[PDB]
Design a protein around this motif. Structure first.
Motif, short mmCIF file in Angstrom:
data_model
loop_
_atom_site.label_atom_id
_atom_site.label_comp_id
_atom_site.label_asym_id
_atom_site.label_seq_id
_atom_site.Cartn_x
_atom_site.Cartn_y
_atom_site.Cartn_z
N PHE A 62 0.73 -1.24 0.13
CA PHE A 62 -0.07 0.02 -0.29
C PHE A 62 0.62 1.10 0.05
O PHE A 62 1.58 1.44 0.96
N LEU A 81 -0.61 -0.85 -4.56
CA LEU A 81 -2.08 -0.22 -4.74
C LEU A 81 -1.73 1.26 -4.07
O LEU A 81 -1.22 1.39 -3.05
N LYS A 136 -7.02 10.16 -1.81
CA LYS A 136 -7.37 10.81 -0.62
C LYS A 136 -7.26 12.44 -0.84
O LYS A 136 -6.32 13.04 -0.66
N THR A 187 -6.74 3.61 -7.48
CA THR A 187 -8.15 4.19 -7.22
C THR A 187 -8.90 4.97 -7.82
O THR A 187 -8.47 5.99 -7.87
N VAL A 235 -14.06 2.85 -5.41
CA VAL A 235 -14.52 3.11 -4.28
C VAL A 235 -15.81 4.07 -4.41
O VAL A 235 -15.72 5.02 -5.39
N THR A 236 -16.82 4.06 -3.59
CA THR A 236 -17.97 4.73 -3.76
C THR A 236 -17.48 6.34 -2.96
O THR A 236 -18.15 7.07 -3.41
N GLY A 237 -16.52 6.36 -2.15
CA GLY A 237 -16.33 7.55 -1.21
C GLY A 237 -17.21 7.56 -0.11
O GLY A 237 -18.47 7.49 -0.08
N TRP A 238 -16.60 7.68 1.11
CA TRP A 238 -17.19 7.67 2.47
C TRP A 238 -17.34 8.94 2.96
O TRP A 238 -18.21 9.61 3.46
N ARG A 287 -25.28 4.37 -2.69
CA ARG A 287 -23.91 4.53 -3.40
C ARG A 287 -23.70 3.20 -4.52
O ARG A 287 -23.06 3.29 -5.31
N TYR A 288 -24.21 2.25 -3.74
CA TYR A 288 -23.84 0.69 -4.38
C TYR A 288 -24.87 0.65 -5.77
O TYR A 288 -24.27 -0.10 -6.77
N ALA A 318 -13.26 -2.57 -2.24
CA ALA A 318 -13.02 -2.51 -0.55
C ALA A 318 -14.42 -2.46 0.21
O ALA A 318 -14.48 -2.09 1.07
N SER A 343 -19.37 -3.74 3.79
CA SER A 343 -20.86 -3.79 4.31
C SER A 343 -21.44 -4.88 3.50
O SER A 343 -20.88 -5.61 2.47
N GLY A 399 -21.81 -3.76 -0.01
CA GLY A 399 -20.39 -3.67 -0.65
C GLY A 399 -19.98 -5.11 -1.03
O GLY A 399 -19.31 -5.08 -2.05
N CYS A 457 -10.10 -6.17 2.71
CA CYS A 457 -10.81 -6.18 3.87
C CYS A 457 -9.61 -5.50 5.14
O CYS A 457 -8.50 -5.92 4.73
N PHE A 458 -10.27 -4.92 6.09
CA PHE A 458 -9.30 -4.73 7.11
C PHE A 458 -8.83 -5.77 7.97
O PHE A 458 -9.56 -6.72 8.33
N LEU A 501 -2.24 -6.87 2.18
CA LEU A 501 -1.85 -5.49 1.65
C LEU A 501 -1.08 -5.06 2.99
O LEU A 501 -1.59 -4.89 3.88
C1 LIG Z 1 -7.28 -1.63 1.13
C2 LIG Z 1 -8.40 -0.59 1.21
C3 LIG Z 1 -8.15 0.55 0.55
C4 LIG Z 1 -9.18 1.52 0.48
N1 LIG Z 1 -8.92 2.59 -0.50
C5 LIG Z 1 -9.91 3.80 -0.39
C6 LIG Z 1 -9.71 5.03 -1.17
O1 LIG Z 1 -8.73 5.17 -1.74
N2 LIG Z 1 -10.55 5.98 -1.15
C7 LIG Z 1 -11.69 5.84 -0.17
O2 LIG Z 1 -12.49 6.86 -0.19
N3 LIG Z 1 -11.88 4.70 0.53
C8 LIG Z 1 -10.95 3.79 0.56
N4 LIG Z 1 -11.27 2.42 1.27
C9 LIG Z 1 -12.40 2.36 2.12
C10 LIG Z 1 -13.28 1.43 1.78
O3 LIG Z 1 -13.92 1.80 0.67
C11 LIG Z 1 -14.29 1.24 2.96
O4 LIG Z 1 -14.19 -0.14 3.55
C12 LIG Z 1 -15.75 1.22 2.63
O5 LIG Z 1 -15.99 2.31 2.23
C13 LIG Z 1 -16.57 0.63 3.81
O6 LIG Z 1 -17.25 -0.53 3.29
P1 LIG Z 1 -18.75 -0.15 2.53
O7 LIG Z 1 -18.49 1.02 1.35
O8 LIG Z 1 -19.27 -1.48 1.95
O9 LIG Z 1 -19.30 0.52 3.79
C14 LIG Z 1 -10.49 1.64 1.28
C15 LIG Z 1 -10.50 0.36 2.15
C16 LIG Z 1 -9.78 -0.92 2.07
C17 LIG Z 1 -9.81 -2.05 2.95
#
Ligand SMILES: Cc1cc2nc3c(=O)[nH]c(=O)nc-3n(C[C@H](O)[C@H](O)[C@H](O)COP(=O)(O)O)c2cc1C
Ligand SMILES: O=c1cc[nH]c(=O)[nH]1
Length: 338
Positions: free
Chosen positions: A7, A47, A51, A87, A118-121, A141-142, A188, A191, A194, A207-208, A310
């Motif tokens: 990473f 990867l 951000k 990403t 990614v959807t963006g949180w 978002r999905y 990633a 949920s 997700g 995943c974490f 990762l």
């Molecule tokens: C390896 C890894 C990389 C990620 N990279 C990004 C990123 O570049 N930008 C971002 O907004 N979120 C990133 N995330 C956040 C994930 O998208 C996060 O797990 C997710 O938004 C929560 O799951 P859900 O979308 O199913 O709720 C990352 C998560 C993981 C585990």
């Protein structure tokens, strides 16, 4: 046998929010040195995240971030074996641009490129530029990503899309060349929605990792991912994110880890809102001697679902070096390497 990725610190100070952590800006040249070293040690992939906004504080944590696609295009041009993932924050780029950027980096890398969707949180990342779609978005978002990926699939698959939905309208949209190899898509999702998204369209799911020195604590998450993938009949394994803090002995690694937790940058940490610490966003953390970290990573490799890890490091250049010189040769799940 398990895949290992890096990473890459596209954001300053990598994944440590601490005045006692190495202080560094993300520059091309550093990421270059990092990825060429990873590649030298047969890491399988690299990867970068994206951000668009930082967390502030004494360390200005992630105030300084490069952009993922252009960074990974540069790293593709200076590598030859490692896989390269960028990403896309899907609110920021139209699918047809992402499609064509992916084809371009396919060309640069000779078929080594994939995309992390990614959807963006983080609402402020999008708010700040007036592009947040409202609070509808958390829940929706999905569906958004579903349409997005359908457009990409058409473009990479046939060169053309007529897709029409709630969020996109293609009218004979064209992208050529198409990728030289099937384009890999990673996701990633944690949920339910997700994981369902990943089960349908991803090649694998990030995943974490969980806890400190509890390597198999993530196992329930990987179990649910595996259950989601049974629902589509597709092979979508888990890649698990850990920070490795390794040294000559357990005592020395623990002293580093404590030393980092001491310097915690609490000011930066408020903006985010044997225990895990917020000093690395409560990341799954492996702290020990080389041999003890090798052992714990071997345990990850036995978790149903887990196809790879990762890795971040407290210090990337010397962390990759010691990983490659001292950790990796002890790992059962890597005995296949040269
Ligand atoms: C390896 C890894 C990389 C990620 N990279 C990004 C990123 O570049 N930008 C971002 O907004 N979120 C990133 N995330 C956040 C994930 O998208 C996060 O797990 C997710 O938004 C929560 O799951 P859900 O979308 O199913 O709720 C990352 C998560 C993981 C585990
Ligand atoms: O957005 C991001 C990037 C890296 N790690 C996280 O937990 N979130």
């Amino acid at each position: 046998m398990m895949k290992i990725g890096v990473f890459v610190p596209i954001g300053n100070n990598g994944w440590l929010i601490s005045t006692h952590a190495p202080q560094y800006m993300p520059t091309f040249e550093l990421n270059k040195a990092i990825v060429q070293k990873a590649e030298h040690y047969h890491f399988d992939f690299a990867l970068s995240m994206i951000k668009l906004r930082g967390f502030g504080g004494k360390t200005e944590f992630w105030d300084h971030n490069l952009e993922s696609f252009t960074l990974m295009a540069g790293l593709a041009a200076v590598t030859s074996r490692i896989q390269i993932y960028a990403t896309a924050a899907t609110l920021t780029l139209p699918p047809a641009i992402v499609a064509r950027m992916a084809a371009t980096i396919d060309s640069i890398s000779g078929g080594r490129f994939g995309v992390n969707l990614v959807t963006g949180w983080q609402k402020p990342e999008y708010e700040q530029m007036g592009i947040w779609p409202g609070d509808d978005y958390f829940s929706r978002r999905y569906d958004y990503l579903t349409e997005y990926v359908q457009v990409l699939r058409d473009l990479w698959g046939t060169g053309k899309s007529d897709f029409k939905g709630d969020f996109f309208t293609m009218n004979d949209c064209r992208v050529s060349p198409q990728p030289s190899v099937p384009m890999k898509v990673i996701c990633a999702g944690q949920s339910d929605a997700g994981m369902a998204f990943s089960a349908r369209y991803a090649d694998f799911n990030f995943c974490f990792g969980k806890g400190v020195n509890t390597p198999t604590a993530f196992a329930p998450t990987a179990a649910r991912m595996k259950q989601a993938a049974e629902q589509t009949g597709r092979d979508v394994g888990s890649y698990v994110l850990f920070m490795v803090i390794a040294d000559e002995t357990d005592d020395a690694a623990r002293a580093k880890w404590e030393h980092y937790k001491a310097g915690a940058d609490e000011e930066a940490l408020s903006w985010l809102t044997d225990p895990t610490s917020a000093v690395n966003i409560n990341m799954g953390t492996l702290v020990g001697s080389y041999a003890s970290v090798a052992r714990m990573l071997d345990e990850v490799a036995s978790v149903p679902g887990a196809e790879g890890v990762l890795l971040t490091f407290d210090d990337f250049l010397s962390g990759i070096e010691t990983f490659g010189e001292r950790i990796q040769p002890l790992m059962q799940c890597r005995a296949h390497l040269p």
